[PDB]
Swiss-Prot record, chain B:
Present with 44600 molecules/cell in log phase SD medium. There are 2 genes for eL43 in yeast. The keyword Cell cycle does not apply. It comes from Saccharomyces cerevisiae (strain ATCC 204508 / S288c). This is Large ribosomal subunit protein eL43A. One of its GO terms (biological process) is cytoplasmic translation.
UniProtKB/Swiss-Prot annotation, chain C:
The chain holds residues 2 to 98 of 119 of the full protein. Belongs to the eukaryotic ribosomal protein eS26 family. It comes from Saccharomyces cerevisiae (strain ATCC 204508 / S288c). GO terms for molecular function: mRNA binding; structural constituent of ribosome. Its main location: cytoplasm. Present with 16300 molecules/cell in log phase SD medium. Component of the ribosome, a large ribonucleoprotein complex responsible for the synthesis of proteins in the cell. The small ribosomal subunit (SSU) binds messenger RNAs (mRNAs) and translates the encoded message by selecting cognate aminoacyl-transfer RNA (tRNA) molecules. The large subunit (LSU) contains the ribosomal catalytic site termed the peptidyl transferase center (PTC), which catalyzes the formation of peptide bonds, thereby polymerizing the amino acids delivered by tRNAs into a polypeptide chain. GO terms for cellular component: 90S preribosome; cytosol; cytosolic small ribosomal subunit. GO terms for biological process: cytoplasmic translation; maturation of LSU-rRNA from tricistronic rRNA transcript (SSU-rRNA, 5.8S rRNA, LSU-rRNA); ribosomal subunit export from nucleus; ribosome assembly. Residues 1-19 are annotated as: Disordered. It comes from the Eukaryota. This is Small ribosomal subunit protein eS26A. Keywords: Cytoplasm, Ribonucleoprotein, Ribosomal protein.
UniProtKB/Swiss-Prot annotation, chain E:
The chain holds residues 20 to 233 of 255 of the full protein. Coiled coil: none annotated. It comes from the Eukaryota. GO terms for biological process: translation. It is found in: Cytoplasm. Its main location: cytoplasm. The keyword Ribonucleoprotein applies. One of its GO terms (molecular function) is structural constituent of ribosome. Keywords: Acetylation, Cytoplasm, Isopeptide bond, Phosphoprotein, Ribonucleoprotein, Ribosomal protein, Ubl conjugation. This is Small ribosomal subunit protein eS1A. GO terms for cellular component: cytosolic small ribosomal subunit.
From Swiss-Prot, chain G:
Belongs to the eukaryotic ribosomal protein eS32 family. Present with 11900 molecules/cell in log phase SD medium. There are 2 genes for this protein in yeast. This is Small ribosomal subunit protein eS32A. Component of the ribosome, a large ribonucleoprotein complex responsible for the synthesis of proteins in the cell. The small ribosomal subunit (SSU) binds messenger RNAs (mRNAs) and translates the encoded message by selecting cognate aminoacyl-transfer RNA (tRNA) molecules. The large subunit (LSU) contains the ribosomal catalytic site termed the peptidyl transferase center (PTC), which catalyzes the formation of peptide bonds, thereby polymerizing the amino acids delivered by tRNAs into a polypeptide chain. Pfam families: Ribosomal_L41. Keywords: Cytoplasm, Ribonucleoprotein, Ribosomal protein. It comes from Saccharomyces cerevisiae (strain ATCC 204508 / S288c) (Baker's yeast).
RNA sequence: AGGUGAAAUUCUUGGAUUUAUUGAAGACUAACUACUGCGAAAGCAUUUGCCAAGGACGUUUUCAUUAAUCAAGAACGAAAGUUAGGGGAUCGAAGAUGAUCAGAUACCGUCGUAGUCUUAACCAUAAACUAUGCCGACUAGGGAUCGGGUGGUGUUUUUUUAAUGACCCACUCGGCACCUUACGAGAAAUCAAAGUCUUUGGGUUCUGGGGGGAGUAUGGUCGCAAGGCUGAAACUUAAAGGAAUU
C-alpha cells in the first residue's frame, strides 16, 4: 500500500551519504551529502550536517511521491575502519523527524574475509 | 675423483661465457641428457634425441616432451585438467 | 624486569598465531596480545528508537542491532579507553567491571 | 522556521574543556512525550524553559 | 534544465506465484522514447527484500529473497526468483562465543536445467545437563556435519525445479530436516539455510515463466 | 629444420577413396609414436584429440588453433605456448579465449583446436651461450642475423648513423605513422624505458 | 645509540674496507 | 569526492565519490578463535579428494638393552635480501612531493618501482622468547580444559528400549597452561621448578668470567652478494650491570 524505496545511508568519518533509491537500485532518486550543507570542511561526517542533509533528501522524496524508506545504513567496511561514523544516527533521527515512513530497518556493510592488508603499516599510523 | 667441484658438465665451456650464465646451464643441460626414464616400458631407454623428442631403445616409443626435459611443470598440469574435465564428459 | 606471567599474552603451547589488524591505526599486533572488545550495540542512540518504532511501519519489527568486533593494539587501548593502567597486585585481574 | 520550546526536567553534570557547559535533559513544551539531551551555557535549574532553534539534535561528552 | 522525473515513468513489482502478496513496491525508469524504451531497458535488475513482507507473516524477520525482473507486462513487473541471502544483523547474532560454526555449499541442476548454489549454516549446542561454559565439535564430527548438510540438499532437490524449491525455503523444511538426520551425530542450534543464489539460468522460457504469472 | 617443437607426421585414412594421405599436426607435450588422434565435433576430449571449442569447456588448453573453422591452424604453434578457453556461448558460435600474448581475442565455437600444449617447453629459458649455436640456429631459418646496430652504420647507410661520438641524435621513438626508411627502432611506443609494474593489461 | 643502528653503521664501514683492500688485493 | 589537529596535494559539465546488475584478476580465508589444537623447530587457521605421517591412549601383542645426552658433521628453518620464469589486485623500502616546523631529508597525507605471491633454487638469520638444555625419579593439593579409556539396568535419544551419539558423576594416563601457599629455592624479582646445593655429587651437550675495544682487525671457511662462520690484540677506565626501596 506504501511506495517503497531504500535510503542506503553511509555512516562514516569525513562525510555521510543519504541517496534514497528504489527497492532494486537500478534507478536512484536524490542523493546529497552532509558536506553540502556546510562551508568549512571537517564537520562533514558531523551529525548537524548529516541532519541538514537528511532534511533535504527528506523533502525531496516527498516531492516524488514515495513514502516508505528502508534504511540500509552502511559502514565504510572492506579493509578500513568498519564502524558507522557520526552520520548514521543524527541522519536516521532526522529521517523520522521529517515524517518519512521508516521500515524493514537493516544494515549492509562490505564485510570481507580479512583478505587484503589494510593501509597504514606495521607500526602503522603513529603520531 | 673430484674433477670439477661445482662446474660438472661445464668444463666444455672453460672460463668464458661468465659464471652465473653457466650455473643456469648445468641445471638444464644435465636434465635433458641423463638416460631418461620411459613411463611406457619402464626401462630408462627413452633418451632425448633432437629438440622436444625422446626415442626409446626398445619399441622406439618417440615421446613428445620439452626442449630440455620429458615434461615441464605446466605440461603435467595439462594431464589433471584433462583427466578432471575428462570424467565430466563421460559421467 | 619480568612483570607478565602470560607474557604479552597467551602464546604458550604454540609458536606463531597470526596478527590481526588494529581497528584504529591498522597496526599489526598478534591475536593474543590484541585487546578484544565486542560492540553489539543497537542501530539507534537515545530516545531515537521512540519516533523510530513510532514514525515507522510494522509494529516495531524486532529492532535489529550491529554485531562488530574491535581489536585495539595496546597504545590505542591505553588512550584512556579500555584500561586506565593497573596495580602490580591486581595486575592479574580477569573481570568485566 | 519550525520553532520548538524546551522545559528543563533533568540537569546532569558538565562537559567542555573549561566545563562552562552543562548537559541538560529537557522535554518539549509543544507535544513533549519525548525528551532530547541538549547543552546549555551559564546557570540552569530544573524549572527553566529554553528555546532550542534546532528541532533535531543532541550532545553529551565534549573534549 | 530537464528534471529526470519529467520523463520518469513509474511502475511496480509483481512476485511469481508461489509467494503471497506479489504486490511488493513501485519503481521508476526513463519513459519509452523513440528508439530505445523502458520495456527493453533494465529487467536485469533485482528486488532484495524480506520474505516476511512478501509472505504476510512478519515472524520471518530475516532471509531477503532477491528477484530478477524478466517481463514488464504493462507497468506490472513479472519478476522471478534469483536467489535468497541472509540478513547480516541476524547471521551476526547466530555466531556466539564458545561454540563452533559448520557452513556447507553445493551446486546442482533442477529438472529444467536450473543451476544454483544453495548454502546452509549450522551451529553446535549444549544439552539439558551441560556444565562447561562452552561447547565445541570433534572436528571429525564437523566433517560428518558438512558430509550430510551438503548431502541433504542434493538428495531431495530437483523436485519441480526452483518452483517447489522456493516453496520449501519458506516452510523452513531444510532447517528441521537438517537437524533431524544430524540428530544421531550432535545436538545443533539454529541450523539455517544461510543463503542461496542463481548463477546459470536456462532459456527465458516464458512458458513456465507464465505458469506463475497468472 | 628451423623450429623448436616436433612435427608429428599423422598418416590419415581417406574415407572418399581407400588411401592414406599423411596430414601434419604440431606435436604437443604428452604424445608419442602410437597415440590415436581423433578430430571432429563428436571426438572425446584427450591430448592430441582436436574439435571445436564449443565442443569443449572453460579452462581446456590447446595450440595450433584456427580463427575461422577451416584455416587449418594458425595461433599457438611455437615451442610450448598454449591457449585457455574462458567466456563461452552455445549459440552465436563464439568462445572468448586467452592467447600467449594474453590477448582476449573472441573466436567461433566451431574453430578447430589441437588439445595439449606444444612440445618445446622452457627453450628460451636456456642461454644460447656461444655465438655459434645462434649462427647454426638462423642458418636453417633466414639470414636475419647477425644484425648491425644503427648508430654503427654511417648517416648514409641508416638514420641512426653518424655523429662524432656514436649517439642516435633524435628520439629512436619513430611514430607508427612514418614510412620505409623513416621507421627504424621503437614504432608506436605507448611507453618506453625500463618496464616495471602493472602490465599485461590495465 | 640504538645498537641495531651501531650494527648497520659498521655494516657499511665493513663492506667499505672490503672494496679498499680489493683495489690493492 | 579524498583526507587530516586542521588544511593541503589530489579527483571532479569528460557526470566523479556515490547506487546498481554484472566481469576478470591476484591475494586472503576474518566472524567461529580460546590464559585452545597439532608440529622438532620455523609454524600451521576455507572445501573436498588423495598421498604417506606423527602423538596420546588402550593392549595377558612383539624384539629384548637394542639406551640417554651429544664437539665434527647432516635435514627443515619466519621475514628481509637473491637468481630466473609465471603473477602481479592491496599494501608498499626507494622516490615523488603535499604539511605542520626554525629546518623535517621525520612522523601525517596522495601515487607508486623492488618486494609482496607462486615455480625451480638460493639464502641459514630474529627479543628464532619458555631471554629458562635434553633424560629420569621424586617433593602438592585444587579445578578447569584437551585426546583416548574404565564403570555407572545414569541424563537425552521414539520409528520400538531398537543401536549408538552428545552430556553429567567419580576414575584415568598423556596434552595444555592456570590458581593456591612455600615446606624449599632464589640478590630480588619471582619459581612445582629456577625445588631435592656448603647436609655442596642421578647421566649428560654447550656456554660464560669487570666494562669497553668488538662479533671488530686478521686470516681461514660457506655464500652470487648481503654478509654467515670462525675470531684477536693493543690501549684505556673503576666502575658497567642486575633487582629493588625511597
Amino acid at each position: 500500500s506504501q511506495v517503497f524505496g531504500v535510503a542506503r545511508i553511509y555512516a562514516s568519518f569525513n562525510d555521510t551519504f543519504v541517496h534514497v533509491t528504489d527497492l532494486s537500485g537500478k534507478e536512484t532518486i536524490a542523493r546529497v551529502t552532509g558536506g553540502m550543507k556546510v562551508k568549512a570542511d571537517r564537520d562533514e561526517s558531523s551529525p548537524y550536517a548529516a541532519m541538514l542533509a537528511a532534511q533535504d533528501v527528506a523533502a525531496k522524496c516527498k516531492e516524488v511521491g514515495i513514502t516508505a524508506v528502508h534504511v540500509k545504513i552502511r559502514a565504510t567496511g572492506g579493509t578500513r575502519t568498519k564502524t558507522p561514523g557520526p552520520g548514521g544516527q543524527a541522519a536516521l533521527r532526522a529521517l523520522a523527524r521529517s515524517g518519512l515512513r521508516i521500515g524493514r530497518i537493516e544494515d549492509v556493510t562490505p564485510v570481507p574475509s580479512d583478505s587484503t592488508r589494510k593501509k597504514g603499516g606495521r607500526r602503522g599510523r603513529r603520531l | 675423483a673430484k674433477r670439477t667441484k661445482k662446474v660438472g658438465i661445464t668444463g666444455k665451456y672453460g672460463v668464458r661465457y661468465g659464471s652465473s650464465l653457466r650455473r643456469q646451464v648445468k641445471k638444464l643441460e644435465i636434465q635433458q641428457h641423463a638416460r631418461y626414464d620411459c613411463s611406457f616400458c619402464g626401462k630408462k631407454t627413452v633418451k632425448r634425441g633432437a629438440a622436444g623428442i625422446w626415442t626409446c631403445s626398445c619399441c622406439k616409443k618417440t615421446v613428445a616432451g620439452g626442449a630440455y626435459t620429458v615434461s615441464t611443470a605446466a605440461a603435467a598440469t595439462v594431464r589433471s585438467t584433462i583427466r578432471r574435465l575428462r570424467e565430466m564428459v563421460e559421467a | 624486569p619480568k612483570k607478565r606471567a602470560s607474557n604479552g599474552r597467551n602464546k604458550k603451547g604454540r609458536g606463531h598465531v597470526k596478527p590481526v589488524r588494529c581497528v584504529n591505526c591498522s597496526k599489526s599486533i598478534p591475536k593474543d596480545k590484541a585487546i578484544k572488545r565486542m560492540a553489539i550495540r543497537n542501530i539507534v542512540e537515545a530516545a531515537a528508537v521512540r519516533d523510530l518504532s513510532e514514525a515507522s511501519v510494522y509494529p516495531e519489527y524486532a529492532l535489529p542491532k550491529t554485531y562488530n568486533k574491535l581489536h585495539y593494539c595496546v597504545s590505542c587501548a591505553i588512550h584512556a579507553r579500555i584500561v586506565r593502567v593497573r596495580s602490580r597486585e591486581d595486575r592479574k585481574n580477569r573481570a568485566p567491571p | 522556521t519550525p520553532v520548538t520550546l524546551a522545559k528543563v526536567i533533568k540537569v546532569l553534570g558538565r562537559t567542555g574543556s573549561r566545563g562552562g557547559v552543562t548537559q541538560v535533559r529537557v522535554e518539549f513544551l509543544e507535544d513533549t512525550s519525548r525528551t532530547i539531551v541538549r547543552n546549555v551555557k551559564g546557570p540552569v535549574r530544573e524549572n527553566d524553559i529554553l528555546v532550542l532553534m534546532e528541532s533535531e539534535r543532541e550532545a553529551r561528552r565534549l573534549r | 534544465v530537464v528534471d529526470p522525473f519529467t520523463r520518469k515513468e513509474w511502475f511496480d513489482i509483481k512476485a511469481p506465484s508461489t509467494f503471497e502478496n506479489r504486490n511488493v513496491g513501485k519503481t521508476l525508469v526513463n519513459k519509452s522514447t523513440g528508439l530505445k524504451s523502458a520495456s527493453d531497458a533494465l529487467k536485469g535488475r533485482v528486488v532484495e527484500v524480506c520474505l516476511a513482507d512478501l509472505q504476510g507473516s512478519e515472524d520471518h524477520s530475516f532471509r531477503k529473497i532477491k528477484l530478477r525482473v524478466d517481463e514488464v507486462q504493462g507497468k506490472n513487473l513479472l519478476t522471478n526468483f534469483h536467489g535468497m541471502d541472509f540478513t547480516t544483523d541476524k547471521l551476526r547474532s547466530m555466531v556466539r562465543k564458545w561454540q563452533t560454526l559448520i557452513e556447507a555449499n553445493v551446486t546442482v541442476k533442477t529438472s529444467d536445467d536450473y543451476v544454483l548454489r544453495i548454502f546452509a549454516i549450522a551451529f553446535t549446542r549444549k544439552q539439558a545437563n551441560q556444565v562447561k561454559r562452552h561447547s565445541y565439535a570433534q572436528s571429525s564430527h564437523i566433517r560428518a556435519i558438512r558430509k550430510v548438510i551438503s548431502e541433504i540438499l542434493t538428495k531431495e532437490v530437483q523436485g519441480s525445479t526452483l518452483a517447489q524449491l522456493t516453496s520449501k525455503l519458506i516452510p523452513e523444511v531444510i532447517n528441521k530436516e537438517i537437524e533431524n538426520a544430524t540428530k544421531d551425530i550432535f545436538p545443533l542450534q539454529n541450523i539455517h539455510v544461510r543463503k542461496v543464489k542463481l548463477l546459470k539460468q536456462p532459456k527465458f522460457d516464458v512458458g513456465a515463466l507464465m505458469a506463475l504469472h497468472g | 629444420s628451423g623450429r623448436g617443437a616436433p612435427l608429428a607426421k599423422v598418416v590419415f585414412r581417406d574415407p572418399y577413396k581407400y588411401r592414406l594421405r599423411e596430414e601434419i599436426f604440431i606435436a604437443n607435450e604428452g604424445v608419442h609414436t602410437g597415440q590415436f588422434i581423433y578430430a571432429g565435433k563428436k571426438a572425446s576430449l584427450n591430448v592430441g584429440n582436436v574439435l571445436p571449442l564449443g565442443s569443449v569447456p572453460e579452462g581446456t588448453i590447446v595450440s595450433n588453433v584456427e580463427e575461422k573453422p577451416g584455416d587449418r591452424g594458425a595461433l599457438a604453434r611455437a615451442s610450448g605456448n598454449y591457449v585457455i578457453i574462458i567466456g563461452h556461448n552455445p549459440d552465436e558460435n563464439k568462445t572468448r579465449v586467452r592467447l600467449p600474448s594474453g590477448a582476449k581475442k573472441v573466436i567461433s565455437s566451431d574453430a578447430r583446436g589441437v588439445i595439449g600444449v606444444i612440445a618445446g617447453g622452457g627453450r628460451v629459458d636456456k642461454p644460447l651461450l656461444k655465438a655459434g649455436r645462434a649462427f647454426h640456429k638462423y642458418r636453417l631459418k633466414r639470414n636475419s642475423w647477425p644484425k648491425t646496430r644503427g648508430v654503427a652504420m654511417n648517416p648514409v647507410d641508416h638514420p641512426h648513423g653518424g655523429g662524432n661520438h656514436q649517439h642516435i641524435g633524435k628520439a629512436s621513438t619513430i611514430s607508427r605513422g612514418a614510412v620505409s626508411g623513416q621507421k627504424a627502432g621503437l614504432i608506436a611506443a605507448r611507453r618506453t624505458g625500463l618496464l616495471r609494474g602493472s602490465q599485461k593489461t590495465q | 645509540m640504538r645498537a641495531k643502528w651501531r650494527k648497520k653503521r659498521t655494516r657499511r664501514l665493513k663492506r667499505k674496507r672490503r672494496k679498499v683492500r680489493a683495489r690493492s688485493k
